[PDB]
Amino acid sequence: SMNPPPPETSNPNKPKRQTNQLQYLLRVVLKTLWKHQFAWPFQQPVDAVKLNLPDYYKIIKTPMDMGTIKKRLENNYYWNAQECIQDFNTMFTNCYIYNKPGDDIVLMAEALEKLFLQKINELPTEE
Ligand SMILES: COc1ccccc1Oc1nccc(-c2c(-c3ccc(F)cc3)ncn2C2CCNCC2)n1
Numbered sequence: 227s228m229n230p231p232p233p234e235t236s237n238p239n240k241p242k243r244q245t246n247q248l249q250y251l252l253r254v255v256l257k258t259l260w261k262h263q264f265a266w267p268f269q270q271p272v273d274a275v276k277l278n279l280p281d282y283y284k285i286i287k288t289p290m291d292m293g294t295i296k297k298r299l300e301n302n303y304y305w306n307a308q309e310c311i312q313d314f315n316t317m318f319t320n321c322y323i324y325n326k327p328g329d330d331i332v333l334m335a336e337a338l339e340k341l342f343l344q345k346i347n348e349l350p351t352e353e
Pocket residue numbers: 266267268272273277279290291317318320321324325330331
């Protein structure tokens with residue numbers, strides 16, 4: 227089945243702001259996750275056509291990936307850090323819903339998620 231368009235990453239009509247926490251989410255969290263050895267399947271939308279997963283977008287109706295998150299952060303798409311954190315969590319959750327526990331892709335997600343949680347533990351206070 228066709229892939230859907232990727233998630234919106236820029237909205238001219240949606241107010242913008244920079245905060246310490248959003249800067250940290252881009253320059254620390256996204257950066258560190260991106261460089262992880264297991265990051266590659268998470269760096270762009272799931273290409274269900276290429277991967278021959280005709281049921282992927284029948285099951286997953288709230289897709290997310292780190293390529294989209296990088297753009298949202300760069301485009302100052304988020305008003306607050308919680309919106310961005312939610313996107314990371316959605317990305318991991320989708321992986322867990324579609325796949326079986328113990329599958330390689332799930333172990334990979336779990337490694338990134340642990341790293342993610344470690345980094346959000348050190349989220350700066352919104353000074
Ligand atoms: C470990 O990745 C792969 C393994 C074998 C073949 C291709 C692979 O690449 C890949 N790229 C993007 C997504 C996925 C993926 C996701 C996926 C990845 C990220 C995400 F956020 C959500 C789902 N869920 C399942 N898969 C594959 C499908 C083929 N059989 C092995 C798992 N795999």
